[PDB]
Amino acid sequence: VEERERIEKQLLLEAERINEIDTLAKAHLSNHFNKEVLLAKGYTLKDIMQAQRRELVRKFVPIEQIKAIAKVSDISHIDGEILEQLVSLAKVNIKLR
Amino acid sequence: LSINERITKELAEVEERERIEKQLLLEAERINEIDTLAKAHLSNHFNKEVLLAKGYTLKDIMQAQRRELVRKFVPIEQIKAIAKVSDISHIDGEILEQLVSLAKVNIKLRK
Amino acid sequence: VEERERIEKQLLLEAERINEIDTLAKAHLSNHFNKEVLLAKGYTLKDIMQAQRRELVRKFVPIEQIKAIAKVSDISHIDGEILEQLVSLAKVNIKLR
Amino acid sequence: LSINERITKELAEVEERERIEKQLLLEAERINEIDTLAKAHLSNHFNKEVLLAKGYTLKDIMQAQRRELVRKFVPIEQIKAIAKVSDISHIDGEILEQLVSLAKVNIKLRK
Amino acid sequence: LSINERITKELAEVEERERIEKQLLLEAERINEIDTLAKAHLSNHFNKEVLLAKGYTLKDIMQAQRRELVRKFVPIEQIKAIAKVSDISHIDGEILEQLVSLAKVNIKLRK
Amino acid sequence: LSINERITKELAEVEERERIEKQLLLEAERINEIDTLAKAHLSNHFNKEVLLAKGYTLKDIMQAQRRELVRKFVPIEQIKAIAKVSDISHIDGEILEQLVSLAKVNIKLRK
């Protein structure tokens, strides 16, 4: 049952990450990308989170840094470790902002 | 071995040689970019001649110049974000390539 | 895989040599012998590099050294490490120039 | 032709061997300098003549003279710190060259 | 693979791990010596905390402290004759170990 | 054998003797060129008479004269471009021929 306990630990970790991302995105980007309206438009939870992350990058991380770390100007398909780097860069930019 | 096999082998060999040629051009461009960045933004102590005299491989010279450029231009929080850590002691590689693209971005915005 | 690693090392070495040759030839000879226009005219990369080297010899290395060290006045067919000697002499000439 | 340039490479390697002959000559000069150090700072019993009579190789004579000079001039604290060990009996080599350099410095400052 | 081969492989593995452990302990003691020398003989501005904040590797901190200690204690003639040059900026290594040993005994004789 | 075997043998023997004669003429021209160069550009102490009295082979005389001519005319900026090191004390052959050709060019442009 400790396997399920650790699974629940990881669930709590990603839930906290999602909550933090949503809380900062609501105050930073817009309310058009709210979880409720995105779900109504028909996007899965992970798709909503990654779209919010990409918007956070496009807002805080300027397009030059975007293409610098993402190695491609379009964040449409860079998702993964590069996307995590970019969202941490967005966190850094808002920290220094 | 029929004619279709002969032609496809010949074209595959030609395309492989052309791809190797493109790789040579890309590596030449990388060398030019590293030399220009080292001459423009980094100190004379990190020159290729003195590093080779100290006994470092060419790739080691490239990654050392890249790391210095990242530390000079890329702020430490940006490093903690992209590299996911502060220390660039062993971060050399494609993450370092992203970080040096960031360094060139920083010099473009700094000019 | 270390065989392919050393092959890539040799690729890097020749790429660096091509870089040095190009960075001096563009500023020394002309824009007519640019890599793009030569490729459009239809010359392979090795042919382009050897033609540029021969032009470098014809610009810096004097004809007496061409007909004495390389034994032929025409650099059209002398290619090899004799061409290496000629381009080294051209490097010395441009260094002293 | 290809033969001309390959023979050029051959004689360039001969030229490198000539440089090896020069560095051999330089090593011989270092040998005579160590001999002068041994005469100036060590007992007559450690002379090359008596050591050869006892039957020791020339390199053995040089390393014995170097070890004695290090023990005489370089204090044991530096000796221990440098060799990472107190004993010099198995420290012949580049570390020994560094130690005899330190001994030369010690006699220079002593004078 | 016979019994003797098994025993020799096991013994070699054990000895290798023991040597690695000894190397770790030696690095520990080296970190000690750098820390104590920096605290006792060098200014607060060269502390590991502030140097790491400025963004220097641990090895860079160690060699910088060593070079500063050598300049502070070891005289310039001694430097010029040990390292064969006045500048210590490119003498990190075994010769740096020699200069820092000379400083270590210099402070002992100063006391 | 049919007569065609000698139609090639008879001609081969004559051609071999003709090539040997041409080689003898080439050697004579080489000796004449060495004599002229030694008389014109090198000191009297390097004359064939005094060198033979000191007991050196004719080929040794030729290579010594060539080496002295190379050192006198060809500067190090080409000696290290062809032989790759400055001195040619033990170096002679194809690089020596290239260097004496370069020295002939050098004296021609000097005049």
User: Cα separations (Å) of D34 from D57, E11, E61?
Assistant: 15, 43, 37
Determine the distance in angstroms separating the CA of D107 from the nearest CA of chain E, rounded to an integer.
11
CA C39 – CA B81 distance, rounded (Å): 43
- Token pair recorded at residue F89: 């004390």
Resolution (A): 9.8
What's the N-to-C CA distance of chain E in angstroms? 61
Contacts of residue A69, defined as CB under 8 A and 6 or more positions apart, other chains included, come to A61, A82, A85, A86, A89, B82, B98, B99, B101, B102
D6–C81: do the CB atoms touch at under 8 Å?
A: yes
Contacts of range B12-17, beta carbons closer than 8 Å, 24 or more positions apart: none
Q: Which of B87, B91, B92, B99 to mutate to test the interface with E (most CBs of E within 10 A)?
A: B87
Q: How was this structure determined?
A: cryo-EM
Specify the amino acid at residue E36: T
For residues E80 and E70, what is the distance between their CA atoms, to the nearest angstrom? 12
Element (H, E) at E96: helix E94-110
B52: chain C residues, CB-CB within 8 Å: none
Is the distance from CB of A18 to CB of A49 less than 8 angstroms?
Answer: yes
Give the distance, in angstroms, between the CA of residue D80 and the centroid of all CA atoms in the same chain: 20
Among residues D10, A59, E100, C17, the alpha carbon closest in space to that of B32 is found at C17
Q: How far apart are CA F99 and CA F92, in angstroms?
A: 10
Q: Which residue intervals of chain B are DSSP H helices? A: 3-41, 48-54, 58-73, 76-82, 94-110
CA–CA separation, E9 and D66 (whole Å): 39
- The answer to whether the beta carbons of residues F45 and F35 sit under 8 Å apart is no
What DSSP element (H or E) covers F97? helix F94-110
Beta carbons of A67 and B101 less than 8 Å apart: yes
Q: Where are the beta strands (DSSP E) in chain F?
A: none
Residue B43 φ/ψ region, left for φ over 0, alpha for ψ in the -120 to 50 degree band, beta for the rest = beta
Q: Is B71 on the interface with E (CB under 8 A)?
A: yes
Chain-chain contact of D8 with F94 (C-beta, under 8 angstroms):
yes
Residues B31 and C19 sit within 8 Å (Cβ to Cβ): yes
Q: How far apart are CA F11 and CA F5, in angstroms?
A: 10
Residue with tokens 């040794």: F60
Output the CA–CA distances (angstroms, integers) from residue D58 to D6, D47, D51, D88, in the order listed: 40, 11, 9, 18
Name the residue type at position C87: V
Do residue D104 and residue E94 have CB atoms under 8 angstroms apart? no
Which residues from E are below 8 Å from B54, CB to CB? Answer: 90
Q: Which residue in chain B has the smallest CA separation from E59?
A: B89
Token output for A9? 């630990």
In the block, residue with structure tokens 């007519």 = C32
Calpha distance C55→C48 (Å, rounded):
11
